Write a sequence for this structure.
RNA sequence: AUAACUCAAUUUGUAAAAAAGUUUUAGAGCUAGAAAUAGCAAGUUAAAAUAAGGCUAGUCCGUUAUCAACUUGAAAAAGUG
DNA sequence: CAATACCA
DNA sequence: TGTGGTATTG
DNA sequence: TTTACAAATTGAGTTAT
């Protein structure tokens, strides 16, 4: 009797019920509650709206951060624990004074001076050590016995802020020396061509505070006859951390583009050295050394002969220079600009020095402020020099201290420990403990150190001790934990669910892939009548001769190196492989290079061992654990080989198990899968064939060896945003089926709808750096500017034309074109992957295809450079160069066209599967499923084109009806489509020369609706005779449906979750709005939080005390229960409310009111709950469809439409009138309405297009939900808010089911 | 439609870490003047907190997902036009 | 208790 | 961006 | 801000059920 239409979105689900003749039914539904109404008429069409479902990222970030905080605190605790006794002998209350430092003097239990406990000693301390780094340096260098408190302070300061762990090994803090060394190995390599390094200050040039490239050019500038692109130049550039290509230096064909910071460098250099010889290893090693020394050089900036604390010395340098320069600046301003002195050094709100030190001004803002002040005056040259160096008036605690490795803090810590252990025995006994406190780090592959109460943890205990940094290796089972880290995420073999999957780089797996690809190769020569398979002997010969001697195997190598040299063929045609084999034996060659024993690798006896080794290399990444794991094989190799093996690492997992590949044997033959791959008589059967062959036993054994709705939907792949929509639409369908008397629909039609700046700037920076371009230095940008498409494309194309080979102009982007690589008539692609910036799109070649062969030939190399620089992707490149591969065939065109109407997205298929499996649950006499309900999926293009062809226009900003209308149209068009063409069920319905034909077929699939293109008035199906569409009266029905005033729009009521409030930590203030950051921290003294989020409101009817005498007065109001207060209120609401001050609370009248709670008042006017103290607009403006269509036409053959617009331009005043009466009845914002009427009367002189486009903006005044601002023409209209929820307390509350068809209304007159 | 492999791109989920920022306190302000108020000297650092907190007491957990109303029911869930 | 600006 | 909390203004 | 890891998914290709 009926079908269902569905439109699934990220913030909405549209639904509709249709009958046989495309009508939507209307029904009487019962109304519950305490009001007048017993029932209500409802149309069976509507839409559910909801806030976006969120990902789990933020929660994760905060969680991990939390853990870091508690662990840091623990570190400090360990330290103090060690210091306890001996500190008790010296100062009874030192640690207590430390821990209560935050407290106001009034609340302190001890003296207000932290370190010593009296004014004179404290002032003395600060006088001697103005910063902590002074004390650090003192304690590192001096030999005197020191106060235990200062020792503690230094150690604790080093431990609390320890630095990163991005560098492995030990650091011992130079550049001149290693530079001389590089020159040495260079000149000792190139005797005929020497370099003169005399008078060259390598230290000042390389450690200079400049960009790496500039410094490179500075160094090269001191070398005559030497250029930056030369070998030595590339070595220095390697040391500066650029991306040099040593190809041109060594006449290579393979580009030696090698970056030092890149993780693959250590293998890139082996790959390169294997080509030019091993004499050159010295050189590159020296280069790396110099690179390290340079890195240490941006960090330290102080001679290592003065002290063993270069870092602290550097901070002290910052201090001294800040002092001197501050004195200088003060004097200068005193002399020359005496009127600006107060502004600069006294006002915190002005970004001067005062705002820099005492205000919220950053170093960048401060530098911005004094730049023209320094420029305007005289004697401020070097100050400007330091300003451009970002080295002017530096603080010591700065944003750029993230460079500091933990090894140097560790260096100072160790030095201090060694220094003072000569006086304090406990420092001697606890040196390594403290060092480990700074050093220890929980491995990422271990996870939280939990004991059964963490859903995130996986680590296994080797003993039931409390875990400390010092007993970690003995208590934690590192191996089992590291293994569990991987195995809890990896797949099992689908075919054998109890078997683990092999490593992707396993030798056996690669043998499998190579043989599987090899088995389906065929060849023909002159003498043979038909192409033949490769035999077992041939396959083995090819493997041994080609696959075991070459990294990759090409077709040419197959022909020449095999078919010519062995089979004696001068010519042969091959069909199994393209250009070169996809599979290869990479691990075989890796291990061949490492262990240097082909016979060992070829011996079948060593199979298990090699598999275990590769497994170890894959499963782990820790070199120590890898080493311990490989110990059982230490007797088989030399120590050198053992270390090389240690360095070798792999990642990634296969798809099949070892038991599937080479374990299970066929009962009759006794052969495994791999055995069949290597030899199978005449029929070289595939893995797919072996697995499905009824004459073998594999299929038998495999078939032998073989989640609620919410969980199922949650486990799908996709954004949680769309998943929310999926669950919601399932629930909607359930309710609709319930409404229809528990009868199932005939059909269900579903349609599914289709920061970054940082990533963009990153892409462009790395790309340009790879390209070695200067365009970034010549044309500097900001990430916010890259939001512009043409500019982003400009930088991605290195400021060149993508079709012509010429430079473009940044200032002329408005004259250029953005062309689509594959025409948008075929591929609806809006991404950068299908877009390109060119001067004129006519230069692309033909507009009917991929860019011409001419262009491809002209630009291929440039595109290659862009590819290697990651400025374009592989897909973009392949699309750009398709013309040399025959361009777009007709098959491709037909395919694209059919893809424009046939959904292929996996997630939608999952939706259809869920619905289908929920509806059809019965099987027939042949044990086959009975499909009572047909689930159809369409793309949005069908309904969109339908609306555009018969003028059922959509304007989103008028109201929310368009979702529901979309669902309806989905149902109609879908059912009609399959009723007309029952053959297309394979394409649209869930479950189990010609190119031109398919093209024209799919391109005119929707022609049966049209009356002329010339077709009959009544459209039926040829075989059945059943009428599918009546052009005379069905369009009328659709038009009546879209014109229906009442449509069930329901905003999902949701409890608010998340953070308690704004994170801002505010200063103290006299306001009850402030919230304590800790239990005893009175916010009037300490400041705290502000602006909490209400989880849900609550209706309270009770009494409150009034006046001095506390007279009980009856009240009725809304109380906002915050997220922080929720658990307490839910534990015992009465006690909570009474604690709030309420008395004699009517417990049974307590009503929970989440956000978006709906209330109705007088003239059909509605409000939604935005908070406990604010409301949202609750009504929908049902504008008559004539006005919607008129607006659509006016705001955007065409001449008939223009004539319609001009003949009906009086519609404007009518639309304004409708908006006006609606606003007067429901919105109640007279000031804004006056502004609107006035502004509209102002621009009544403007063209019709413009007036329509700006009338579009006016609907935000009447839109459902939260009020917002909008510009009519140039007049901004500020939002009017509903800052009181009082009127709601006497309105009628409305409880709605998911469709809004079931209602319970409560008159809040109590 | 499905399976294995090659190349690339995207998305989701988890763990271990760094540097800032903010807040209160501690870095004896000095003179003149009864008084607000002038004139000048100064500033770079540190401690502690970083969701209130919880029991399961761990070097653990605390911001995702999920949620009309009513009848029941501790609760989970069923039922109701 | 408006119009209303600023904030995260 | 959008939108609910807050102090200020009257 | 940095490091380490797994899984789908899309889409250009080779071979199959
Ligand atoms: Mg805490
Ligand atoms: Mg030179
Ligand atoms: Mg600071
Ligand atoms: Mg190939
Ligand atoms: Mg590994
Ligand atoms: Mg939530
Ligand atoms: Mg800080
Ligand atoms: Mg509801």
């Amino acid at each position: 009797k009926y079908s269902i239409g569905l439109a699934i979105g990220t913030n909405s689900v549209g639904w509709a019920v249709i009958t046989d003749e495309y009508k939507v039914p209307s029904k009487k539904f019962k109304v519950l509650g305490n009001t007048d109404r017993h029932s209500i008429k409802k149309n069976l069409i509507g839409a559910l709206l909801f806030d976006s479902g969120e990902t789990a990222e933020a929660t994760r970030l905060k969680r991990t951060a939390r853990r870091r905080y508690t662990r840091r605190k623990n570190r400090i605790c360990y330290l103090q624990e060690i210091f306890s006794n001996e500190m008790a002998k010296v100062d009874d209350s030192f640690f207590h004074r430390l821990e209560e430092s935050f407290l106001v003097e009034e609340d302190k239990k001890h003296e207000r001076h932290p370190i010593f406990g009296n004014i004179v000693d404290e002032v003395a301390y600060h006088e001697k050590y103005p910063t902590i780094y002074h004390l650090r340096k003192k304690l590192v260098d001096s030999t005197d016995k020191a106060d235990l408190r200062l020792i503690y302070l230094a150690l604790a300061h080093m431990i609390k802020f320890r630095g990163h762990f991005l560098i492995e090994g030990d650091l011992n803090p130079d550049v001149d020396k290693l530079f001389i060394q590089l020159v040495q190995t260079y000149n000792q390599l190139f005797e005929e061509n020497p370099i003169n390094a005399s008078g060259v200050d390598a230290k000042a040039i390389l450690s200079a505070r400049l960009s790496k490239s500039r410094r490179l050019e500075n160094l090269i500038a001191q070398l005559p006859g030497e250029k930056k692109n030369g070998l030595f130049g590339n070595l220095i550039a390697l040391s500066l951390g650029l991306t040099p290509n040593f190809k041109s230096n060594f006449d290579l064909a393979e580009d030696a583009k090698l970056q030092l910071s890149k993780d693959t460098y250590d293998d890139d250099l082996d790959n390169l050295l294997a080509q030019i010889g091993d004499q050159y290893a010295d050189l590159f090693l020296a280069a790396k050394n110099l690179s390290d020394a340079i890195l240490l050089s941006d960090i330290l900036r102080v001679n290592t002969e003065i002290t063993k604390a270069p870092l602290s010395a550097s901070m002290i340098k910052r201090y001294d220079e800040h002092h001197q320069d501050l004195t200088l600046l003060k004097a200068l301003v005193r002399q020359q600009l005496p009127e600006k002195y107060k502004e600069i050094f006294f006002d915190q709100s002005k970004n001067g020095y005062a705002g820099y030190i005492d205000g919220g001004a950053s170093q960048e803002e401060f530098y911005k402020f004094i730049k023209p002040i320094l420029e305007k005056m005289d004697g401020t040259e070097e100050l400007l020099v330091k300003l451009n160096r970002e080295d002017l008036l530096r603080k010591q605690r700065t944003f750029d201290n993230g460079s500091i490795p933990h090894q140097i803090h560790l260096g100072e810590l160790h030095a201090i420990l060694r220094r003072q252990e000569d006086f304090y025995p406990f420092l001697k006994d606890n040196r390594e403990k403290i060092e480990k406190i700074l050093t220890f780090r929980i491995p990422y592959y271990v996870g939280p150190l939990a004991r059964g109460n963490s859903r995130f943890a996986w680590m296994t205990r080797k003993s039931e001790e409390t875990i400390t940094p010092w007993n970690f290796e003995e208590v934690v089972d590192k191996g089992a934990s590291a293994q569990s880290f991987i195995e809890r995420m990896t797949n099992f073999d689908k075919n054998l669910p109890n078997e683990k999957v092999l490593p992707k780089h396993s030798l056996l797996y690669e043998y499998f892939t190579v043989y599987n690809e090899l088995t389906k190769v065929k060849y023909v020569t002159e003498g043979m009548r038909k192409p033949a398979f490769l035999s077992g002997e041939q396959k083995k010969a090819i493997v041994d001769l080609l696959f075991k001697t070459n990294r990759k195997v090409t077709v040419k190598q197959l022909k020449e190196d095999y078919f010519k040299k062995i089979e004696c063929f001068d010519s042969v045609e091959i069909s199994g492989v393209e250009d070169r084999f996809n599979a290869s034996l990479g691990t075989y060659h890796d291990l061949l290079k490492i262990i240097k024993d082909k016979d060992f690798l070829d011996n079948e006896e060593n199979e298990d061992i090699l598999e275990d080794i590769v497994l170890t290399l894959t499963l782990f990444e820790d070199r120590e654990m890898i080493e311990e794991r490989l110990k059982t094989y230490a007797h088989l190799f030399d120590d050198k080989v053992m270390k090389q093996l240690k360095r070798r690492r792999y990642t990634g997992w296969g798809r099949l198990s070892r038991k599937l590949i080479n374990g299970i044997r066929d009962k009759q033959s006794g052969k495994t899968i791999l055995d069949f791959l290597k030899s199978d008589g005449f029929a070289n059967r595939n893995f797919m064939q072996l697995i499905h062959d009824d004459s073998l036993t594999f299929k038998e054994d495999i078939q032998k060896a073989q989640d609620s709705l919410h969980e199922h939907i949650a486990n799908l792949a996709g954004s949680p945003a769309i998943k929310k929509g999926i669950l919601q639409t399932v629930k909607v369908v359930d309710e609709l089926v319930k409404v229809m008397g528990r009868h199932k629909p005939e059909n269900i039609v579903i349609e599914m709808a289709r920061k970054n700046s940082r990533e963009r700037m990153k892409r462009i920076e790395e790309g340009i750096k790879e390209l070695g371009s200067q365009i970034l230095k010549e044309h500097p940008v900001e990430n916010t500017q890259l939001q512009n498409e043409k500019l982003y494309l400009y930088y991605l194309q290195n400021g060149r034309d993508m079709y012509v080979d010429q430079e473009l102009d940044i200032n002329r982007l408005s004259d250029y074109d953005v062309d689509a690589i594959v025409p948008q008539s075929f591929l609806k692609d809006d991404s950068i992957d299908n877009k390109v910036l060119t001067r004129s799109d006519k230069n692309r070649g033909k507009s009917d295809n991929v860019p011409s062969e001419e262009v491809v030939k002209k630009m291929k190399n440039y595109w290659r450079q862009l590819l290697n620089a990651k400025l374009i992707t592989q897909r973009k490149f392949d699309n750009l160069t398709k013309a040399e591969r025959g361009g777009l065939s007709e098959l491709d065109k037909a395919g694209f066209i059919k893809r424009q109407l046939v959904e292929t997205r996996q997630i939608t298929k999952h939706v259809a599967q869920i619905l289908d499996s929920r509806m059809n649950t019965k099987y027939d006499e042949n044990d086959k499923l009975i499909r009572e309900v047909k689930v159809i999926t369409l793309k949005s293009k069908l309904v969109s084109d339908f609306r555009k062809d018969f003028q059922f226009y959509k304007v989103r900003e008028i109201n929310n009806y368009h979702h529901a209308h979309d669902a309806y149209l989905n149902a109609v068009v879908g059912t009609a489509l399959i009723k007309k063409y029952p053959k297309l069920e394979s394409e649209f319905v869930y479950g189990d020369g010609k190119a031109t034909a398919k093209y024209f077929f799919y391109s005119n699939i929707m022609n049966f609706f049209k009356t002329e293109i010339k077709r009959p008035l009544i459209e039926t199906n040829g075989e059945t005779g059943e009428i599918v569409w009546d052009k005379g009266r069905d369009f009328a029905t659709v038009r009546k449906v879209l014109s229906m005033p009442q449509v069930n729009i329901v905003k999902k009521t949701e409890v608010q979750t998340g953070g308690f409030s704004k994170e801002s930590i505010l200063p103290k203030r006299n306001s009850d709005k402030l919230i304590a950051r800790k239990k005893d921290w009175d916010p009037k003294k300490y400041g705290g939080f502000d602006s909490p989020t209400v989880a849900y409101s609550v209706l309270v009817v009770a009494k409150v005390e009034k006046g001095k005498s506390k007279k009980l007065k009856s009240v009725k109001e809304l109380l906002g229960i915050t997220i922080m207060e929720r658990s307490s209120f839910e534990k015992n609401p009465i006690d909570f409310l009474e604690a709030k001050g309420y008395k004699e609370v009517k417990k049974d009248l307590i009503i929970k009111l989440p956000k978006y709670s709906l209330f109705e008042l007088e003239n059909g006017r509605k409000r939604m709950l935005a908070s406990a103290g604010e409301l949202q607009k609750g009504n929908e403006l049902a504008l008559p469809s004539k006005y919607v269509n008129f607006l659509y036409l006016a705001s955007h053959d065409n001449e008939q439409k223009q004539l319609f617009v001009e003949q009906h331009k009086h519609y404007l005043d009518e639309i304004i009138e409708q908006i006006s009466e609606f606003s007067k009845r429901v919105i109640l914002a007279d000031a804004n309405l006056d502004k609107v009427l006035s502004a509209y009367n102002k621009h009544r002189d403007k063209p019709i297009r413009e007036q329509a486009e700006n009338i579009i903006h006016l609907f935000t005044l009447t839109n459902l939900g939260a009020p917002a601002a909008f510009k009519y023409f140039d007049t901004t209209i500020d939002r009017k808010r509903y800052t009181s929820t009082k009127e709601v307390l006497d309105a009628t509350l409305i409880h709605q089911s998911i469709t809004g068809l079931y209602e319970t209304r409560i008159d809040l007159s109590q």
DSSP finds 55 helices and 25 strands in chain A.
